[PDB]
Enzyme design. Structure first.
Site, PDB file in Angstrom:
ATOM      1  N   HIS A  45       0.799  -1.209   0.000  1.00 25.14           N
ATOM      2  CA  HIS A  45       0.000   0.000   0.000  1.00 25.14           C
ATOM      3  C   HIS A  45       0.844   1.278   0.000  1.00 25.14           C
ATOM      4  CE1 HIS A  45       0.953  -1.095   4.057  1.00 25.14           C
ATOM      5  NE2 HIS A  45       0.678   0.137   4.453  1.00 25.14           N
ATOM      6  N   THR A  48       1.780   4.324  -4.562  1.00 25.45           N
ATOM      7  CA  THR A  48       2.804   4.256  -5.596  1.00 25.45           C
ATOM      8  C   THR A  48       4.100   3.519  -5.306  1.00 25.45           C
ATOM      9  OG1 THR A  48       3.514   6.448  -4.862  1.00 25.45           O
ATOM     10  CG2 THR A  48       1.928   6.334  -6.684  1.00 25.45           C
ATOM     11  N   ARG A  49       4.751   3.052  -6.370  1.00 29.98           N
ATOM     12  CA  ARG A  49       6.003   2.334  -6.213  1.00 29.98           C
ATOM     13  C   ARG A  49       6.867   2.701  -7.424  1.00 29.98           C
ATOM     14  NH1 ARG A  49       4.229   1.369  -2.064  1.00 29.98           N
ATOM     15  NH2 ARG A  49       4.249  -0.456  -0.664  1.00 29.98           N
ATOM     16  N   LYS A 265       5.812  12.568  -2.217  1.00 21.81           N
ATOM     17  CA  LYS A 265       5.908  11.441  -1.295  1.00 21.81           C
ATOM     18  C   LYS A 265       7.364  11.079  -1.093  1.00 21.81           C
ATOM     19  CE  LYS A 265       5.131   6.666  -1.584  1.00 21.81           C
ATOM     20  NZ  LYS A 265       4.342   5.515  -2.124  1.00 21.81           N
ATOM     21  N   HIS A 269      14.896   4.859   3.073  1.00 21.69           N
ATOM     22  CA  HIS A 269      15.177   3.443   2.813  1.00 21.69           C
ATOM     23  C   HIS A 269      16.134   2.707   3.748  1.00 21.69           C
ATOM     24  CE1 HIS A 269      15.008  -0.052   0.262  1.00 21.69           C
ATOM     25  NE2 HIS A 269      16.252   0.045  -0.173  1.00 21.69           N
ATOM     26  N   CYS A 315       4.371   0.798   6.287  1.00 20.47           N
ATOM     27  CA  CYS A 315       4.412  -0.409   5.491  1.00 20.47           C
ATOM     28  C   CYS A 315       5.612  -1.273   5.915  1.00 20.47           C
ATOM     29  CB  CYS A 315       4.379   0.063   4.033  1.00 20.47           C
ATOM     30  SG  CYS A 315       5.106  -0.966   2.752  1.00 20.47           S
ATOM     31  N   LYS A 348       8.448  -3.551  -8.246  1.00 20.00           N
ATOM     32  CA  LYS A 348       8.647  -3.311  -9.669  1.00 20.00           C
ATOM     33  C   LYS A 348       8.790  -4.595 -10.460  1.00 20.00           C
ATOM     34  CE  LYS A 348      12.375  -1.006  -8.594  1.00 20.00           C
ATOM     35  NZ  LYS A 348      12.642  -1.593  -7.242  1.00 20.00           N
TER      36      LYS A 348
END
Ligand code: FAD
Ligand code: CL
Length: 385
Positions: A45, A48-49, A265, A269, A315, A348
């Protein structure tokens, strides 16, 4: 209605893509999920990715990246849901001090990918809204971009069900019973059997693979993202602001242009809290790091996007020790396929993995080269229980 050709446990990013690939071939498939995909309890969720082709994590991922890109364009033409926007992807970092930037450039050169190389003020000039030091250099991939992850899963599901796939929701698989010539799963809603099993439970792979006598190091991480009120004249996808993944001294960050005014957004990471998917706190802002780590990046590199926090999401990543995926047959059960440990960068490839999983489940082999994702590789530290 209880025995199937193939059973997929975990119908999320990887599982739903495999389900679509299997249904498309007339294979009777049952997909079982603890929730109702797409949902907000797993790893897909946040709307976007990013999809990148020149791959910083390793040039060996390029082929799967390119096949996945082609499959995303095919999906776009098959559904009414929006799948992909070609925002392009910008990768930058201090010159000669980013392994990620370096490998992205090398991966591009090696696969003859179309990219623009620029540095210092050239970056600031091209994209008003980005402010990097003069010693920074970058590589921009104009033809990669952004996927709408929830739409991807919903489309794959609709297509697969239309083709006959059955989806059993809100049903948590509690155990497995594998035999030489069949597989079985136990749930509170009943037991189901099939000839082949695909296991793709995301963060839950770290807890449940032991039920398959597998002992593989897998660590779930809580990873948040925030949407910020931004200067639309600079950060909107409409004015070509790009998606990005960059490495600065304190780590790697990734972000997206504002779509329809949803705000830019951003995600950090490199850092996340070690958690268990059953006890993780999914509320954004409960840790000071949630919002502060993001604003420290924005104030320095994209100041015009450092406005009010419009929305926050929580997430999960599921990391392997070497941060490479696990896509392979169970060492002791050729009729069991495992997809795990996508380490924060697997969405992806989900279209391509769906294909790989389908092939492994039906033939025990795949036309793709997935040796680097071997479940028996040393860097994994895998063994039986
Ligand atoms: C979290 C995150 C990840 C991420 C990202 C940003 C954030 C905040 N940005 C990415 C990006 O820009 N580009 C990219 O390629 N990847 C990016 N990611 C990583 C990507 O989202 C993950 O690698 C991917 O989603 C992993 O997919 P997977 O299919 O493994 O995980 P899932 O979608 O969560 O699906 C798992 C499903 O299985 C079900 N489940 C779990 N346990 C059970 C049991 N016991 N029984 C039945 N079903 C079960 C879940 O409900 C879930 O649906
Ligand atoms: Cl992940």
């Amino acid at each position: 209605s209880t025995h199937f050709d193939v059973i997929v446990v975990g119908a999320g990013s990887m599982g739903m893509a495999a389900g679509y690939q299997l249904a498309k071939q007339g294979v009777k498939t049952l997909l079982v999920d603890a929730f109702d995909p797409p949902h907000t309890n797993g790893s897909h969720h946040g709307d976007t990715r990013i999809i990148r082709h020149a791959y910083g994590e390793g040039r060996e991922y390029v082929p799967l990246a390119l096949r996945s890109q082609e499959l995303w364009y095919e999906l776009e033409k098959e559904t009414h849901h929006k799948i992909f926007t070609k925002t392009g992807v910008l990768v930058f970092g201090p010159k000669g001090e980013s392994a990620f930037v370096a490998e992205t450039m090398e991966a591009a050169k090696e696969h003859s990918l179309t990219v623009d190389l620029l540095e210092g003020d050239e970056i600031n000039k091209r994209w008003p809204g980005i402010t990097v030091p003069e010693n920074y250099n970058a590589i921009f991939e104009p033809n990669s971009g952004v996927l709408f992850s929830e739409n991807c899963i919903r489309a794959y599901r609709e297509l697969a069900e239309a083709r006959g796939a059955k989806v059993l929701t809100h049903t948590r698989v509690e155990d497995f019973d594998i035999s030489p010539d069949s597989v079985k799963i136990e749930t509170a809603n009943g037991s189901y059997t099939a000839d082949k099993l695909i296991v793709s439970m995301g963060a839950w792979n770290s807890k449940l693979l032991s039920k398959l006598n597998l002992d593989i190091p897998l660590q779930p991480y809580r990873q948040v993202v925030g949407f910020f009120e931004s200067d639309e004249s600079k950060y909107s996808n409409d004015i070509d602001f790009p998606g990005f993944m960059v490495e600065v001294p304190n780590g790697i960050y990734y972000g997206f242009p504002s779509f329809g005014g949803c705000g830019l957004k951003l995600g950090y990471h490199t850092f996340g809290q070690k958690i268990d998917p059953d006890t993780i706190n999914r509320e954004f802002g409960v840790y000071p790091e949630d919002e502060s780590n993001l604003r420290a990046f924005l104030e320095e590199y994209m100041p015009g996007a450092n406005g009010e926090l419009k929305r926050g999401a929580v997430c999960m990543y599921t990391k392997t020790l070497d941060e490479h995926f696990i896509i392979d047959l169970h060492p002791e059960h050729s009729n069991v396929v495992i997809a795990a440990g996508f380490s924060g960068h697997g969405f992806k490839f989900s279209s391509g993995v769906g294909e790989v999983l389908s092939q492994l489940a039906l033939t025990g082999k795949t036309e793709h080269d997935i040796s680097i994702f071997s479940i028996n590789r040393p860097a994994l530290k895998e063994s039986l229980q």
